[PDB]
Design a binder for this molecule. Structure first.
Ligand SMILES: O=S1(=O)N[C@@H]2[C@@H](O)[C@@H](O)[C@H](O)[C@@H](CO)[C@H]2O1
Ligand SMILES: [Ca+2]
Ligand SMILES: [Ca+2]
Ligand code: NA
Length: 434
């Protein structure tokens, strides 16, 4: 057997990323997303008022890969062109994790003050969504120019995925208000945990009350649980360290369920642990890595194995599965990053080469299924051979899985792997070595 040449595989990831970037420059320059089958662009936040989403998402990946000319071309576009004084509604959660976080990682890589100025300007526009709630729970949408808010029927992910970006803003700016605003919203829902330690995933920004009874690790909730741990790691916050482990141990006690010998975390009633759903999202795979981070690595490996089963059986992990049968519930995909997310997070603990093996399967399968004329695309149908394609490269592809693969394979000297911290959008918030 020829041992894998990990440096060669990293160089292939870089080559493919640079090739994809060239397609973006050719077909979608300054636009939010490329449609790489048609060779066109689409808007993400505001129809017809693109904000360079994929360009911004790509920046820290480009830098980490040593694609310096490409990085600088993107940074220079941002500095000349990007602004947020726009009379249109933006989804607060998406805007923070993609644009605030993408500008912050680019700022930390480069030192360029303008990138921080723009991140902070955008955060100040998002802050109006928090200020519009007497509980500090952000409304889901805000008008970037006027501050007008819409839709208070929100969820843990959309109230609780700010503290990393906002806390880094507080560190860099010296203004504590960003950290405090993000932490306050998380504390609100944690103070409403049931006696079994769970939160329902759906919450109202104005009443402050839960609007469902369903505890979740995936839809409506995922990154809330990450950002508790990540705030301990990034800021030393004692409360978040406590909360992170309490929340995960409640989930292990009441949501961990085995079906056909495999670990899943279906939805349960947040006050009884009784099962209220049978679906698991592909996107739940982040949790395997979080389990390892919080000191539950055997459980994290067991959960990873459930997704390794889906990859081995279906090639591409189905977008959703029925835990009771282990079979797909959907045939389309979102070109999703969570399996290599988990592999990188678990690999950062002891550098076990098994995680590299598994992530290499995932990268090669992405190449075999999602490659299109001008980049990489989400899929229409994973059950046909070949798998049929839809026509969209999601913005998160630019920040997430190509970075994950590259960090797993490259051992790049541009990252201090002991200090590396990643947001839920894979924006690097600590660990650059200039
Ligand atoms: O399942 S999600 O709703 N939560 C994920 C975020 O944490 C980011 O990783 C990224 O924007 C997408 C990756 O699939 C999100 O899809
Ligand atoms: Ca994520
Ligand atoms: Ca994480
Ligand atoms: Na990024």
């Amino acid at each position: 057997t020829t041992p894998e040449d990990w440096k060669a595989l990293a160089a292939d990831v870089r080559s493919e990323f640079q090739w994809a970037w060239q397609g973006y420059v050719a077909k979608a320059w300054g636009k939010d997303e490329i449609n790489p089958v048609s060779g066109t662009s689409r808007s993400f936040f505001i129809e017809g008022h693109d904000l360079g989403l994929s360009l911004v998402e790509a920046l820290d990946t480009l830098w980490i890969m040593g694609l310096d000319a490409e990085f600088q071309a993107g940074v220079d576009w941002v500095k000349a062109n990007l602004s947020f004084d726009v009379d249109g509604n933006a989804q607060v959660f998406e805007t923070n994790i993609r644009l605030v976080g993408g500008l912050l990682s680019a700022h930390l890589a480069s030192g360029d003050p303008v990138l921080l100025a723009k991140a902070r300007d955008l955060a100040d526009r998002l802050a109006k969504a928090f200020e519009a709630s007497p509980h500090g729970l952000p409304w889901r949408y805000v008008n970037l120019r006027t501050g007008a808010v819409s839709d208070p029927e929100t969820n843990l992910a959309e109230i609780g995925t700010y503290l990393s970006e906002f806390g880094v803003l507080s560190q860099l700016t010296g203004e504590r208000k960003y950290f405090d605003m993000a932490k306050r919203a998380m504390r609100h829902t944690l103070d409403r945990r049931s006696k079994i330690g769970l939160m329902a995933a759906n919450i109202h920004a104005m009443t402050g009350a839960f609007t469902s009874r369903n505890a979740s690790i995936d839809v409506y909730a995922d990154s809330f649980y990450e950002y508790l741990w990540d705030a301990w790691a990034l800021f030393g916050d004692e409360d978040c360290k406590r909360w992170a482990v309490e929340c995960v141990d409640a989930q292990l006690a009441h949501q961990a369920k085995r079906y056909d010998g495999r670990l899943w975390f279906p939805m349960v009633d947040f006050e009884t642990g009784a099962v209220t759903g049978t679906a698991q999202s592909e996107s739940a795979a982040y949790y395997a890595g979080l389990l390892g981070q919080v000191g539950r690595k055997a459980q994290g490996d067991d959960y990873l194995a459930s997704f390794t089963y889906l990859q081995a059986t279906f090639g591409v992990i189905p977008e959703s599965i029925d835990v009771t049968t282990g079979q797909p519930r959907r045939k389309h995909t979102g070109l999703r990053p969570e399996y290599p997310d988990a592999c990188l997070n678990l690999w950062l603990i002891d550098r076990d080469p098994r995680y590299r093996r598994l992530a290499a399967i995932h990268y090669r399968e992405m190449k075999a299924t999602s490659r299109a004329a001008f980049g990489y695309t989400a899929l229409k149908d994973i059950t046909t051979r070949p798998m049929t394609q839809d026509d969209n490269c999601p913005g998160y592809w630019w920040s997430e899985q190509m970075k994950y693969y590259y960090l797993l394979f490259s051992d790049t000297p541009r990252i201090d792997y002991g200090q590396l911290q990643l947001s839920t959008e894979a924006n690097v918030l600590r660990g650059f070595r200039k």
